[PDB]
Amino acid sequence: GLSDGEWQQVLNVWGKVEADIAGHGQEVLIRLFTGHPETLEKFDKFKHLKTEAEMKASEDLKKHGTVVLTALGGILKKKGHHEAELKPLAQSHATKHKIPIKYLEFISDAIIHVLHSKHPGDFGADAQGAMTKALELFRNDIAAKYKELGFQ
Ligand code: HEM
């Protein structure tokens, strides 16, 4: 698990995200799509986006970035006590959206990248450590639900 101190760091970093939820959400998805174009193919409503300029100008992509980070923020504020919040997300990502766990690794990496990119010098080694742990807890608890479903 994470320590009390580590949770405090995680939720302190998250305060940065909440100052511009849509902006952070959009950059996370753009980083995911551009670094891993196979991921874009999982989204029927975003696969029309051919260039980063189109992605950047998509108001619906910003909207979905808001949905995504609002859900993740809810989970992180549970500090590991997130079974009821996490299970349904795990289940829709495996069963409906067909998202391999690797793509969750990709988006964890993208969040870390975006945090550094948006807050250069304001996302210290201790904070990266804490947030990385939170994100591996998230990914690991989803992977358990994936195994249950036998989903690959
Ligand atoms: C931080 C991790 C993630 C969070 C918090 C998250 C959250 C959400 C939420 C809250 C929804 C809407 C409700 C639902 O369908 O369950 C959603 C939909 C969706 N998610 Fe994610 N997700 C994450 C990772 C991913 C990844 C890595 C992919 C890979 C492509 C993905 C693909 C999708 C797709 C295709 C939908 C349907 C979008 C639509 O057409 O409306 N998600 N996600």
Residue with CA at minimum distance from ligand 1 atom 24: 104
Query: Residue 9: CA atoms inside 13 Å, Cβ hemisphere, count?
Result: 19
Give me the domains of the chain, ranges plus CATH numbers. Answer: 1-152 (1.10.490.10)
The rounded distance, in Å, linking the Cα atoms of 62 and 78 is 25
Structural method: X-ray
**C-beta of 144 in contact with ligand 1 (< 6 A):** no
Which residues are within 8 A (CB) of 42 and not within 5 positions of it... i.e. 6 or more apart? 97, 98, 99, 103
The angstrom resolution of this structure is 1.9
Cα end-to-end distance, the chain, whole Å: 25
Out of 29, 62, 64, 68, give the residue to mutate to test ligand 1, the one with the largest number of ligand atoms within 8 Å of its CB: 68
The rounded distance, in Å, linking the Cα atoms of 8 and 2 is 10
- Contact predicate 13/130, CB 8 Å: yes
Rounded to the nearest 10 degrees, how much is the dihedral formed by the CA atoms of 74, 80, 83, 84?
A: -30
Q: Where are the beta strands (DSSP E) in the chain?
A: none
Q: Which amino acid is at 31?
A: R
- Contact predicate 115/12, CB 8 Å: no
